[PDB]
Ligand SMILES: CC[C@H](C)C(=O)C(=O)O
């Protein structure tokens with residue numbers, strides 16, 4: 001039994017924290033939003049994969065200083081608040097705790113590492129999951145859920161890193177989730193970028209969810225062209241993606257229930273979009289490697305313009 | 311004194327027809343929309359260049375068959391209705407009449423020529439003008455107005471073509487308008503594409519007019535990148551554009567009053583967008599020449615998706 005801290009309990013942190021708690025883990029949730037609703041009513045999950053689950057009462061906190069020291073810290077906040085997140089992580093971390101960033105984008109761990117003690121293990125978890133907040137304290141899980149974990153930084157030699165990644169994967173597999181130990185975290189992040197870069201931004205720009213985007217020949221063609229830009233950029237930066245990865249991802253999204261990506265909800269509620277991690281960082285890495293992504297570049301420009309308007 | 315027929319009296323046909331009529335020309339207007347409002351109240355112009363002008367009564371018609379034979383036919387309709395326009399043009403044309411397409415896009419005359427007798431002269435007129443319909447029968451002219459004319463097809467040898475283009479330019483110059491006889495109609499159309507391709511589509515996609523688009527660093531950078539794609543495509547198809555044409559066009563739009571391109575109004579009223587002439591035709595010409603325009607291609611895809619939605 002591990003003591004798990006969830007720093008940022010949105011849809012992502014709520015889902016994985018509840019799943020771990022239901023597998024018998026000791027999970028402590030840090031709430032910045034919905035603290036009293038959740039500490040009242042608890043945490044509920046409607047899931048087309050796992051059925052209905054409820055956590056009540058929940059070990060809930062409004063302040064990281066009140067949390068007990070945790071051996072694993074799952075970070076489910078958006079990448080936009082990661083700077084402000086570091087003191088909360090340090091406060092809740094037991095000595096040698098493992099920090100797992102259940103976050104999308106590129107370069108996330110690298111930008112957080114300067115703010116975390118080198119005695120902490122820093123890992124990324126790429127979640128392929130259709131999940132969003134419903135009513136307060138209610139998580140709506142539509143499909144998937146698997147987590148690809150990888151190691152970024154920490155006081156672990158090269159054998160120990162593989163061991164720690166497996167320990168993390170086993171946590172999720174023990175909870176009934178698909179989980180894979182990745183050899184290369186950056187390669188894993190490029191894999192997830194091929195999905196988030198087209199679908200997150202186009203859902204905002206075209207005011208659409210996955211099903212209309214895939215039913216229309218023109219948006220389907222645009223999504224595939226953007227995918228090939230990310231695949232190319234990754235190759236230019238030294239990362240091989242699997243053969244025919246674009247059709248592989250396109251087919252999974254046709255199978256996918258009609259889904260609004262997180263960035264769609266962010267723009268719908270006036271929250272800041274995750275542009276820095278999902279677009280700016282890959283574009284800069286692609287530029288430094290001499291590789292141009294014209295469609296992604298223009299999509300990023302369009303999203304920055306939309307964010308600056310009324 | 312020429313007898314002028316205006317086939318399609320929107321903002322563009324209304325403006326140039328009224329200006330010609332005010333210079334003493336005998337102008338006959340074909341109205342598909344606002345016929346009874348215009349035949350009632352007449353045609354009014356609020357213009358920051360020419361001041362207020364009114365045409366009342368107007369020689370108005372609901373049917374091309376009622377029009378007298380005209381020596382010049384000014385076509386101010388959108389490019390979307392050009393197929394249906396041909397019988398109206400043939401009906402209103404005097405023998406050897408000149409047909410002048412005051413329309414944007416590429417390949418417009420080529421697609422209309424099969425539907426017009428070869429005894430008619432077919433010309434294009436590229437209008438650089440900020441104009442839109444206000445209240446019914448009222449034209450709102452914000453800036454510019456110049457017309458670059460060029461010859462496409464007709465029963466005229468090579469000397470006569472220059473003469474006819476000059477005759478047309480003189481018509482507009484005699485009415486107080488800037489007008490230039492172009493040696494090459496297709497080159498002139500590529501020139502105007504550098505403005506319409508970015509600004510028309512981005513105004514729809516970003517729900518914005520020219521001033522916010524130019525005030526924002528990201529949209530300004532995107533507009534310039536799109537301009538360079540069109541300049542490159544034109545060069546690939548064998549047409550040289552003037553040196554630094556992009557900055558030349560960008561500076562004119564900074565000077566320009568806040569302006570909603572025609573395509574913005576089209577999408578706002580549920581009218582079909584001019585995608586075929588402004589995007590599809592240049593993209594196909596660029597493809598046939600081995601030149602790729604990734605941003606324009608993606609912009610075109612986005613606009614086709616938006617048109618197919620609710
Ligand atoms: C299956 C991919 C899923 C939609 C996801 O993980 C995301 O929204 O980023």
Ligand SMILES: CC[C@H](C)C(=O)C(=O)O
Nearest residue numbers: 437438439440454571572
């Ligand atoms: C000056 C360019 C003007 C805005 C125009 O001609 C158009 O809308 O197509």
